[PDB]
Structures are given as structure tokens and as C-alpha cells.
């Protein structure tokens, strides 16, 4: 009876919309009992199975739907979504393209196709496909919100104010109607949403995990209530998809090995396979235990492994980012579960207990922005492995080509030995800065740069062109190894002015908004002799930024773009800037640590969101409060002072140069010890029978 089955199918659709997925599944199945050859019920059932993470069962039903109805466009598009989740991009594309072939006006299929282009880095095509979707279906929250993010990525600010208004209105409607918001939690920081809206977005995404673990029918775990089974050692589990060549590893790769084996037993749970890098090698060798959970795709069996390991504190380093398996945390295999470092915001999730942060980043008065209890590190929660990865940058020398500290820079593990081989090296006392006069050796180096040569030899020492690192040692370029040569870095390599101030920002362009570019333009106009240095991150954002800047009155030559560089070159070339202008919308995080390691002062204006306050936290730890602006006028005033008062610039640069070493900011040994003290606070609290509470002293 297709008629009765149709009624059941429609009722299932309604239940599905209401978030009652179990009842929907039951009804679709009943529809198939009444009408076994019901293509629509097969396809609709598959979609809810997909929601429950039953991907192979979903595929089976999609294929059944298409067997019954070979031109069933909805089934193809829906099947494409499942293949995409399965990491079969070619298959997904084949499905979406088939769906559009059948129905040229299939809005959802155009939007789903767009998502592939977006993920591939083809933003213009994503934008085109999302626009087609919105033309065919103007009320389409998923397409609108994903289009908004595409535009954000390339700094396309067309109708920006109205766009933000609509995003907020969409989210409000979805929240009121109990639907999953079309704005991703990780992106919510970029839009003028209330803190309440941002937390509610995160909460609802957190709840999706339950759809995927509910079908596992697992009981609650019994947790350890003491450290007896572990010989008085606290078992800490670090869970991350980013053990390998990823910013997360560039920040914390040293921490597992630095933990005190007398008090802690460290387990690292990798959600990704071995990428073959030294980052992966290091963590695997230095953790007490290393577990490749990428080999255990079932979250149930994977959670079982974590529980059976006896983990006391399980640490979520992904939050809502690519590669996350928050389902593992939803199963609570550990008695205490903490967010740390990898995700700049609240999980909003029932299954997370704490967020490790700090007083500057997350002041107590903003506790309402987070579902987790706040757990303060004593300085900043941020950390970086720069002192271990890039020790060649601890010292520098310059060439006096006329004394600037940032026009022609030398760095090298054997730099002092090289300098000692020269008869005429002078010192500028700040540690202090050796200067090579404009001699035969200096011309030799400059010639190498101008001739585009890869490297030369002087007094037995290899002197490398900083633009050619991948040709000399690719491991040194990625940061897997410390470069063994003396490296030359020059403003001329990047087309930077020799006789003007360079303001830089090396972040992905999506962190810039109209208000920020306007601030920057205000600074440039007040400091005639200056340029802004940005990255093609991505390159298609460049012409957009240029257009807005030109319209603000800045000629094209005041904004210099460089390509994204290998890790080592990126950190090293920060030495060429005078000042970094931080993005207030979302700060540099890793990027902030990168620029400070070069000794480059960073001007920041902290906001209310965690992501907007990290840079100020870094600077507070560094001991440079003069770089923290309370408002737009001050941000501008500070940057302008640094660009016009060269004696003040010199003093602030010296402060950063010294304090990156003397302060706790890059001190991983110290950080780890403080992290441990915090872990023990959490444990003692739990062992006394307490639920989580703020650890903010």
C-alpha cells in the first residue's frame, strides 16, 4: 500500500524535523514493511542512519533506492553526503554531479557540491555553487551560512552589514525552533552573535555526538577513585587528530616528554594515522604510551580502550575541528575531561568538565560564555615549542649595508663561530647584536641574494639563502629539524622597503574584517613611511583586500603580499617586520607565538570571546602590557607611536627580544610543571567526591 507507506513516510519526515530520530527510523522502517519497493523511504531512512553514524547501512539503502528508481535525484545527492563523510570525495562528486544532471534546479545538490569545492580550496567555485543554490531556494540556511564563510575566507565583504544581520537572524530562528544551527561553532567567533548564541550553537553541535553514541547502547563507565592501580601516578590521556605536522604539535610536542614520570603516566591517543614526520616520531617515542585510535574506527571499542587504560584525566585537543571524535568524550571513559589548547572556544557540551585557560584569556566575569568550569594556568594557557624547534633564532646578527636590526639578518647554530672568523665584527649592546660592516664578506652575501643563489661558503661556513631552504634541507624547512647552516634573511627577498616601517600580520585572511582593515588604514595614513605586510592566505583574498584598501585611500604599493612559506621561513622572516598588528576579530594564536619568537612587538585589542583575547594573554605573560589596547583609538595610537618614535620602537623591540627568553612564555619545562599542578588540583577535587568547579583561585 503506497498510500499508507506514504503517510508513514511523511510522519517520519515530521519526527525527523523535530529531532526525534529514533521514531523517524522506526516509521521509515514501518513504511518499508508496508511498501518494500518504496524508494523514498529507503533514501530517507538512509539519511537518518547517516546521522547515527551507520554509514555502511545508509549506503546499502541509498543503493536500494537507486535500484528501484534510477533517476532518483534526492537519493544521489543524499548518497553523496554519506560518501563525503566516508572521505570518498570522488564518489561524492560523482553523486552530486549525477543529481544535478537529473534535476538542474536541485538546490540542495548545488549546495552540497559547493561544500566539496570549499573543502578543496576552490572558493570561487564554491561561491558560485552556493549562489546557484540560493537562487533556486532563497530560504536555505546551510547554503547562506556556508557561503558567508566562503566570503569571509577571501575577505569579500559585499553587503557585509546586511550579511551579518541575516546570519544572526538565521541562528536566532534555528535556536528558537530547536534546529541545529547552520553556523559552525568554530566560525561563530567571527560573527556578531551574542555569547549566549555562541554557547548554544556549540551545545547543539555537542549534542549531535549523542545521536552517534546512543545506538551503541553502552552503560556508564566506572571510574578510578584513587591512584593505587597506577602506583600513585596520575594517568593523563591526550586525544588529538594532530600528532604530526600540524600547529597543535608545533605548540605542545615537547610536553608529553617533559611530564614527571614520578607523578604522571602519559598516554597519547592519536585520531590520525602516522604522517611520517618527526613530530609524530617525537610524540610516539616520548609519551609513556602511544595509541593509534585511527585503527579503531568504532567509538565504542575506542572508548573501551581509553577506559581500560585507566585514564584519570582525558584531554580534548580538537573541540570542533577537522578530525575530532568527540563521541569518545561523550562516552565519558574518564572521570575528568578537559578542553585544552586545540580549540579556541567552549564545547558547550555536557561531556566536557573543564576548559584550561587563564585569567587574561577568560576572566571570571565571562564565565557565562562557557559550559565548562574555568581552569586557570598561572600565566597563559598558550604555549609553543619554538625554543626547541627554532633555536637558531635565539640569536641574530645583521649586516650594516649603509644600524637597522631588521633589514639583513643572519641566524645560525654556528653563527658565533662564523662571526669569530671575521676581523671586523662590531657589537651593538641592547643580549646584544653583532654587526658585520659593508665589507667583502657582506657584498658576497648580498650578491647571493640578488643573484638568487642557493648558498655560498665563507671561511668554511655554509651561508644559505633563506628563500631556498627546501632545496637545502626540507626537514629544516618544515621545522622537523634545526637548520645546520647560517641563514640569510632580507627585506629585499620579499620586496619590503629598506627605509620604511613594516607592519605585519601573518594570519589567515579570514581573521580580518572591514573594521580591522580600516584601523590598519588609519595607522598607515598617520605613518606615511610605512607598509602593511600580509600573506596570500589564500591568494584570492589579495585583490579583495587591495580593493577595500585602495577605496580607503591607500595606494597598492602600501600593502605588500607574500606567499605562505614553510614553517621555518615563516617564523624566521618575522624578524624583518618592525611591528605586528594583531587581528581583533580572532587573534593570532600559533601565529602570535610565531611573531613573538622573532622578537617582533605585537599590538592587540582584546575582545570578549576567547579567540579575541589570546594575544593579550601572550603579551601579559611576556610582560608587555604597553602593547594591549583597550579600544580602537588606543590600538591605533600605540601602532602609530611605534612607527614614528624610533627610540620607543627600539626599546619595545629589545623588551620583546629579551623577554621571549626570560619570561615563561616559551618555557615548556615550566609550563608542564604548572600544567601538572593544575591536573593534581582537578584530581584532588574529584577524589574528594566533588563535581567540577572553577579552579581560578
Amino acid at each position: 500500500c503506497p498510500t499508507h507507506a506514504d503517510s508513514l513516510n511523511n510522519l517520519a519526515n515530521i519526527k525527523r524535523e523535530q529531532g526525534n530520530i529514533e521514531e523517524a527510523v522506526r516509521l521509515y522502517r514501518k513504511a518499508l514493511e508496508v511498501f518494500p519497493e518504496f524508494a523514498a523511504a529507503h533514501s530517507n531512512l538512509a539519511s537518518v542512519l547517516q546521522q547515527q553514524g551507520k554509514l555502511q547501512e545508509a549506503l546499502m539503502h541509498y543503493k536500494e533506492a537507486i535500484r528501484i528508481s534510477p533517476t532518483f535525484a534526492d537519493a544521489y545527492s543524499n548518497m553523496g553526503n554519506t560518501l563525503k563523510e566516508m572521505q570518498d570525495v570522488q564518489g561524492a562528486l560523482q553523486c552530486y554531479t549525477r543529481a544535478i544532471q537529473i534535476n538542474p534546479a536541485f538546490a540542495d545538490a548545488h549546495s552540497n557540491l559547493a561544500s566539496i569545492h570549499k573543502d578543496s580550496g576552490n572558493i570561487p567555485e564554491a561561491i558560485a555553487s552556493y549562489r546557484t543554490a540560493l537562487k533556486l531556494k532563497p530560504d536555505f540556511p546551510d547554503a547562506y551560512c556556508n557561503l558567508a564563510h566562503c566570503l569571509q575566507i577571501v575577505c569579500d565583504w559585499t553587503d557585509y552589514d546586511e550579511r551579518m544581520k541575516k546570519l544572526v537572524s538565521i541562528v536566532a530562528d534555528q535556536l528558537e525552533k530547536n534546529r541545529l544551527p547552520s553556523v559552525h561553532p568554530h566560525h561563530s567567533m567571527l560573527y556578531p552573535l551574542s555569547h549566549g548564541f555562541r554557547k548554544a550553537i556549540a551545545e547543539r553541535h555537542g549534542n549531535l555526538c549523542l545521536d552517534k553514541i546512543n545506538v551503541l547502547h553502552k552503560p556508564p563507565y566506572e571510574h578510578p577513585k584513587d591512584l593505587k592501580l597506577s602506583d600513585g601516578r596520575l594517568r593523563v590521556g591526550y586525544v588529538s587528530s594532530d600528532f604530526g605536522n600540524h600547529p597543535t604539535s608545533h605548540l605542545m610536542q615537547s610536553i608529553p616528554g617533559m611530564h614527571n614520570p614520578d607523578k604522571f603516566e602519559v598516554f597519547c591517543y592519536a585520531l590520525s594515522p602516522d604522517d611520517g614526520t618527526n613530530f609524530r616520531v617525537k610524540v610516539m617515542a616520548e609519551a609513556n604510551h602511544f595509541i593509534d585510535l585511527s585503527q579503531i574506527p568504532c567509538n565504542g571499542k575506542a572508548a573501551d580502550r581509553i577506559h581500560q587504560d585507566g585514564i584519570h584525566i582525558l584531554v580534548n585537543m580538537n573541540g570542533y575541528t577537522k578530525g575530532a571524535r568527540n563521541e569518545l568524550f561523550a562516552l565519558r571513559p574518564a572521570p575528568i575531561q578537559a578542553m585544552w589548547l586545540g580549540y579556541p572556544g567552549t564545547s558547550g557540551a555536557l561531556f566536557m568538565d573543564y576548559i584550561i585557560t587563564d585569567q587574561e584569556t577568560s576572566p571570571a566575569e565571562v564565565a557565562e560564555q562557557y559550559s565548562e568550569k574555568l581552569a586557570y594556568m598561572p600565566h597563559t594557557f598558550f604555549i609553543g615549542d619554538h625554543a626547541n624547534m627554532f633555536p637558531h633564532l635565539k640569536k641574530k646578527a645583521v649586516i650594516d649595508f649603509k644600524i637597522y636590526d631588521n633589514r639583513i639578518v643572519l641566524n645560525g647554530i654556528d653563527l658565533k663561530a662564523f662571526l669569530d672568523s671575521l676581523p671586523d665584527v662590531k657589537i651593538v649592546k641592547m643580549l646584544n647584536m653583532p654587526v658585520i660592516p659593508m665589507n667583502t664578506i657582506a657584498e658576497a652575501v648580498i650578491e647571493m641574494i640578488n643573484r638568487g643563489q642557493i648558498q655560498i661558503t665563507i671561511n668554511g661556513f655554509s651561508i644559505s639563502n633563506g628563500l631556498a631552504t627546501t632545496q637545502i634541507n626540507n626537514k629544516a624547512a618544515t621545522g622537523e629539524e634545526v637548520p645546520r647552516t647560517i641563514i640569510v634573511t632580507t627585506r629585499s627577498q620579499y620586496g619590503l622597503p629598506e627605509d620604511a616601517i613594516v607592519y605585519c600580520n601573518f594570519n589567515q585572511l579570514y581573521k580580518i574584517d572591514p573594521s580591522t582593515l580600516q584601523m590598519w588604514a588609519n595607522i598607515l595614513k598617520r605613518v606615511p613611511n610605512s607598509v602593511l605586510w600580509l600573506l596570500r592566505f589564500p591568494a584570492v583574498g589579495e585583490p579583495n583586500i587591495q580593493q577595500y584598501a585602495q577605496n580607503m585611500g591607500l595606494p597598492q604599493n602600501r600593502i605588500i603580499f607574500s606567499p605562505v612559506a614553510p614553517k621555518e621561513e615563516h617564523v624566521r622572516r618575522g624578524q624583518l617586520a618592525d611591528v605586528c598588528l594583531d587581528t581583533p576579530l580572532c587573534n593570532g594564536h600559533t601565529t602570535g607565538m610565531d611573531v613573538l619568537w622573532a622578537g617582533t612587538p605585537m599590538v592587540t585589542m582584546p575582545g570578549e570571546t576567547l579567540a579575541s583575547r589570546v594575544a593579550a594573554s601572550q603579551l601579559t605573560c611576556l610582560g608587555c602590557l604597553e602593547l594591549i589596547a583597550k579600544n580602537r583609538q588606543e590600538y591605533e595610537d600605540i601602532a602609530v607611536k611605534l612607527g614614528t618614535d624610533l627610540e620607543y620602537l627600539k626599546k619595545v623591540r629589545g623588551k620583546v627580544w629579551k623577554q621571549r627568553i626570560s619570561s615563561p612564555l616559551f618555557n615548556t619545562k615550566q609550563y608542564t610543571m604548572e600544567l601538572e599542578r593544575l591536573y593534581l588540583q582537578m584530581w584532588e577535587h574529584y577524589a574528594a567526591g566533588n563535581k567540577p568547579d572553577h579552579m581560578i583561585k
Binding site: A40, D74, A75, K84, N112, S115, K118, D119, A143
Partner: peptide, 10 residues
């Protein structure tokens, strides 16, 4: 990892 849209067939 950009999310997608399932179509409910009536």
C-alpha cells in the same frame, strides 16, 4: 570539513 544538507523526500 564543511557540513552538507540531506534532502527529505515527500
Amino acid at each position: 570539513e564543511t557540513g552538507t544538507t540531506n534532502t527529505a523526500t515527500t
